[PDB]
């Protein structure tokens, strides 16, 4: 039961001053709500591409490479 | 003092104080030349064969002679049918033996041929050199290359010149120059070739900087973190990924259709395929020495062998208790090794269902494997309380070297192509370079971030190293800095950053060019 | 012709500069060690990408 995609919520109870208790947040629902709900979205199929990361030791400024704006060269 | 302990232990233990190869080589070399020369060089094809065949008949290797004659009959089925039939002692053979073949050639072409033969002397060059010196005479002339429509033939035909004696003597230049349309110093020539070639050797490195390198990146989309392992084939034609969903997926790297030998699958159009049959996550994939066979290992504890011609499993190996983590083909692809959770290193051949060698001595799980380029040694690394590297001999099954010094989980091992240097990487960002014969550490390389360096690769001459990291960077390392002319270590040559793609595999080609692969995470 | 003349008129200065650089590099058939090295940069590749988008 730990593969659920629902968000995990916690509720808080009190045993007194400074004595909190935590319980899992659940709630009874109807079968109509669960059965009639829509399905999630299907992701696209696996694929691959290619591009030049460097040419003769220099990275070109193409959309597929990171921008210069955003520690790679020695400075000793 | 460990030295005192070792000395005491040693003191107390009693220690005192054939022709077809050459023909194919020549054929390929002729195929790789410029067109303007191809007319001349082909004249060498017919003699080298005939005499060679006769030689076998003289040495009693009748079966080899028959095989050679049959294999090369196709190349000459359209011209030499009568001669082939006669060969399959006659007076023609006696004439061949008594009269040495004449092979006219150009001076520069002869020089190129001699230098090429010397350059490949031990791979088949010696055979052709001996055959030419014994049963041939290469009458060299200072003319230009001769072709049916080159300047030489056109000029000679237009001016109605005669036929030169050297080129007079089953196709010959005469039929191209006829109206119907010098000697040699072999052996001495080889000596001169070697003497002159010895004058252009580079013998040091003083000053300058490292070497420029190009990189090509392959990126995988819509994987959702299900990809566990990746591998490239030997010729950079295929890529395979194993996932957490128990299946393997293979793609052709240029998008062309993949081919199947099944009759029903004749002329099928798909450029990727799925290998199904494991029951748990796949943690290793290894291409065999075009690649025909694939090896995989999974968390279910099994090793599987697949055929890439029919795309189906052939054999299952079941020698492990618990998950298998790594599997590796040998340098030439008949032996292979595996390791995993139960702390033992196993060596198999594809011939036998049971492992042929078992290696015991690690105190923890195995996390990395590597072979030696000679095929007789293996390397293993363990984690946790025992972070050491062990070297195993395959003939006996014993350990011969232990390397110590890592304090983080080890992710990769790699041996240099010269068989003398070892490299390892861990999750702290360090790379250790070890001398194998002395068992000592040569040096450390720093600059990668933390998380793991899954892949390393050496260049053809083993003077440069390339590493790929989970910090989304690819880095290049100088194995020896040049002599003084008089966070990151100074031996790094280059670092290339990727666009939100951790690097899983990097490999060097024959040139100063590398290929890397990874999965894109937009978040 | 006329297209050839326009081409020459448009490219003369750059061709002269490149020829002068190459001539200075290899004076006397010897690699002069005091001349600038031949290195690849990012501005030149940006110019190439501009031309490629033009094409």
TrEMBL record, chain A:
Q: Where in the cell?
A: Nucleus
Instruction: Family membership, please give it.
Output: Belongs to the TAF6 family.
Q: Supply the name of the protein.
A: TBP-associated factor 6
Q: Which organism is it from?
A: Chaetomium thermophilum (strain DSM 1495 / CBS 144.50 / IMI 039719) (Thermochaetoides thermophila)
Q: Which start and end residues of the full protein are shown? A: 81 to 160 of 480
From TrEMBL, chain B:
Where can this protein be found? Nucleus
One Pfam family from the UniProt entry?
TFIID_NTD2
Q: Where is the TFIID subunit TAF5 NTD2 domain?
A: 18-136
- SMART domains linked to this entry: LisH, WD40
The residue range of the signal peptide is none
Q: Which GO terms describe its molecular function?
A: RNA polymerase II general transcription initiation factor activity; translation initiation factor activity
Q: What biological-process terms (Gene Ontology) are attached?
A: transcription initiation at RNA polymerase II promoter
The keyword Acetylation is assigned to this record: no
Positions annotated as WD repeat: 220-254, 317-358, 359-402, 403-444, 453-480
| Keywords, ordered alphabetically | Initiation factor, Nucleus, Protein biosynthesis, Repeat, Transcription, Transcription regulation, WD repeat
**GO CC, alphabetical:** transcription factor TFIID complex
Official protein name in the record = Transcription initiation factor TFIID subunit-like protein
Species the sequence originates in: Chaetomium thermophilum (strain DSM 1495 / CBS 144.50 / IMI 039719)
